[PDB]
Design a protein around this ligand. Structure first.
Ligand SMILES: O=C(/C=N/O)Nc1ccccc1Br
Ligand SMILES: [Mg+2]
Ligand SMILES: [Mg+2]
Ligand SMILES: [Mg+2]
Length: 713
């Protein structure tokens, strides 16, 4: 066929050529040696990869059977002893501190937003990489953070009343963040630098900063600067001065904009936010990841670092780019980009580590300017969907082997651990320990975690509704426990403690109001879906001193094993019939809305309107939750298969309507069983209870491959 033979492997030609012609040159790795390494690593580690997956299934079968033989509110003591007997719940290791070294300041020290985007989308990826600095005025004027009340609405052209509120909001932020010795930024008439100090002119007098150490730099003439640079909680704030701009001309000090350092780090995602089901899809992804690391990805282009004058008069530079992670896929899936002699597909996680690692070498050297990514010499890989410490140890050993193939020093490849599976949650300390010399973050992937919570306890009884899950005891303990485990392993000053994604892309007023809870909880980072959201979330890190919060949480134990293990079962007679229908409609709409873009267009993340037409930006995990929740309700007789059918039928034309204005869209209604997308949605629900750990990829990949093959002829 069209495959290349390397030992026991048969590699898709498009992948082979991409790696030879694009990825390898410039790395000084012998191509022959790389490919022999691919074959050897695959041969050596494939058996334990499979053994790990079989172990998952064996644990789940035992738990399924534990619930099925029980009639009695759970006896927690018994349930725990049981989880311990079967090896689900492992002993907690002794106290230790992580030793991870060679890590950039953005990760060890800086608290701020972390932006996650689909690596298949070059535009979004480039915009994300450039999102290290963002316009606060654009983010305020462009969103509902400033209410679109009467008089202040957005029109075809600039609205002065709204622009003045934007200005006012920012002046208030400045007062909160970098206070003057007296007076307010609201009344400033000019900025100058005198004797290395910022001098702010007010109408009656002049003043300096209450804390002059927050003055970081400036641009232009000291006596008439074009910008002033400030710093607060490790994050930079830049005031752009330009009275001959449309906004500056209206401004009392001629201020044009306030630029915030926003997306400090970015995760280029090969997993839940993309649809990649074969060699062609992987290659598009890998090529974008290459372009980012070489610095030559073009839609526009990547930003250079930013030049400043130091307060005393010297020159310095700040990074213009978000420091990049890459999120590889997890342990489950195989991909036909490589098959062995028997025709069996190779594990995709093993592939990603080899290829994303190889590609990452370019980000460690000069872009044909300075090197794009890690100055300290690390490669930052996020590893999702791991269950427990043996799976973390496997990932570390995988990275160890790749480092040898690639000629990198041991521990170059760092690991961002997603805590998004129950067996990792209740063994978190051991998971950190297994990666104690590689770990650069832990992060509560709460959506996947919810899916796994449902599947794990599928046989226990009917679960609460989807929108109820976020406030359940188990998840709130899970969030606290994650922070506690990180801090106790010495993450403060060493590694990020991260929390999850804000998915409501149009609800920015709400994000600003509520997401402050995450750095208040000691999270040094949290996820956002867009550069705009990164800029707004940045506000929270100026309001909250994360380093102090973490110092104050030290030694505390806020969650017990019992709370972590509290299954979210619905109480007796929880729902009226209309509330049941509403939940069914909600979940069917969520599934259909997501799956139609996934199967038909190969889109894994996008702005999808929900049932109430709220715009959501979720990844594949939302599908895992909804499919598992409906499977769980069907399993326990809350709804019937005809209820499911009827809701899918009702929701499909609505999804069809919601996708008007999509050039390539093809309706699901009314020819339902003509639509592969529709059949996928149905299959995800009806086979949901039988998917390993509730995972949606096996069905989703098959259906997308089916769609591609039909579209070919
Ligand atoms: O937050 C998550 C969690 N993943 O484990 N992923 C994500 C990535 C891009 C847009 C929306 C989402 Br939710
Ligand atoms: Mg996830
Ligand atoms: Mg409920
Ligand atoms: Mg402070």
């Amino acid at each position: 066929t069209d495959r290349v033979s390397v030992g026991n492997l048969r590699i898709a030609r498009v992948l082979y050529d991409f790696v030879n012609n694009e990825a390898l040159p410039g790395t000084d790795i012998d191509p022959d040696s790389f490919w022999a390494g691919v074959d050897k690593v695959v041969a050596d580690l494939t058996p334990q990869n499979q053994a790990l997956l079989n172990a998952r299934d064996e644990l789940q079968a035992q738990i399924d059977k534990w619930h099925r033989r029980r009639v009695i509110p759970i006896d927690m003591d018994a349930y725990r002893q049981f989880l311990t007997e079967i090896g689900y719940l492992l002993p907690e290791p002794d106290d230790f501190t992580i030793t991870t070294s060679g890590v950039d300041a953005e990760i060890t020290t800086t608290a701020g937003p972390q932006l996650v985007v689909p690596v298949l989308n070059a535009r979004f990826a480039l915009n994300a990489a450039n999102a290290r600095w963002g316009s606060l005025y654009d983010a305020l004027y462009g969103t509902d953070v400033i209410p679109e009340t009467d008089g202040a609405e957005k029109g075809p052209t600039y609205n002065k009343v709204r622009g003045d509120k934007v200005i006012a909001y920012a002046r208030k932020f400045l007062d909160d963040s970098v206070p003057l010795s007296s007076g307010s930024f609201g009344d400033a008439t000019g900025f100058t630098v005198q004797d290395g100090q910022l001098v702010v002119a007010l109408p009656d007098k002049s003043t300096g900063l209450a804390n002059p150490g927050q003055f970081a730099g400036y641009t232009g003439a000291a006596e008439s600067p074009t910008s002033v640079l400030l710093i607060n909680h490790g994050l930079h704030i830049e005031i752009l001065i330009d009275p001959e701009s449309q906004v500056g001309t209206t401004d009392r000090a001629g201020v044009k904009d306030v630029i915030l350092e926003s997306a400090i780090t970015t995760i280029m995602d090969f997993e839940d936010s993309v649809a990649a089901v074969d060699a062609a899809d992987k290659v598009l992804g890998y090529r974008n990841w290459l372009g980012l690391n070489k610095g030559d990805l073009a839609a526009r282009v990547l930003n250079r670092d930013r030049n400043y004058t130091a307060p005393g008069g010297g020159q310095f530079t700040l990074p213009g780019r978000s420091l990049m992670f890459v999120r590889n896929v997890g342990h489950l899936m195989t991909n036909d980009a490589i098959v062995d002699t028997d025709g069996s597909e190779v594990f995709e996680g093993i592939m990603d580590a080899l290829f994303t690692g190889l590609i990452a070498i370019h980000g460690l050297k000069a872009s044909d300017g300075p090197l794009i990514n890690s100055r300290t010499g690390s490669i930052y890989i996020v590893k999702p969907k791991m269950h427990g410490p043996a799976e973390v140890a496997f990932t570390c050993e995988l990275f160890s082997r790749v480092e040898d193939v690639l000629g990198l020093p041991q521990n170059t490849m760092k690991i961002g651990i997603m805590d998004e599976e129950r067996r990792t949650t209740v063994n978190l300390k051991a998971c950190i320990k297994a990666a104690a010399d590689r770990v650069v973050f832990i992060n509560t992937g709460f959506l996947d975690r919810t899916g796994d919570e449902i599947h794990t306890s599928m046989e226990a009884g009917p679960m609460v509704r989807k929108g109820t899950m976020k406030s359940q005891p188990w998840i709130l303990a899970y969030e606290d426990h994650n922070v506690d485990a990180g801090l106790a392993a010495g993450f403060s000053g060493r590694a990020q403690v991260g929390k999850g994604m804000w998915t409501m892309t149009e609800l920015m007023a709400d994000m600003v109001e509520t997401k402050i809870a995450q750095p208040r909880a000691g999270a040094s980072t949290a996820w956002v879906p867009s550069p705009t959201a990164a800029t707004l979330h940045a506000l929270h890190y100026h309001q909250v001193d994360v380093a102090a919060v973490q110092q104050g949480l030290a030694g505390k134990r806020r969650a017990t094993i019992e709370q972590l293990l509290t299954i979210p079962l619905a109480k007796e007679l929880a729902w009226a019939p209309d509330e049941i229908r509403e939940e069914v409609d909600n979940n069917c709409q969520s599934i259909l809305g997501y799956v139609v873009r996934w199967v038909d267009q190969g889109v894994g993340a996008s702005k999808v309107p929900d049932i109430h037409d709220v715009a959501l930006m979720e990844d594949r995990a939302t599908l895992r939750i909804s499919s598992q929740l409906l499977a769980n309700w069907l399993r326990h007789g809350v709804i019937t298969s005809a209820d499911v059918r009827a809701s899918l039928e009702r929701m499909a034309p609505l999804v069809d309507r919601q996708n008007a204005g999509d050039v390539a869209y093809r309706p699901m209604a009314p020819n339902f069983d003509d639509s592969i997308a529709f059949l996928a949605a149905q299959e995800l629900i009806l086979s949901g209870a039988q998917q390993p750990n509730g995972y949606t990829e096996p069905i989703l990949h098959r259906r997308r491959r089916e769609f591609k093959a039909r579209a070919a002829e």
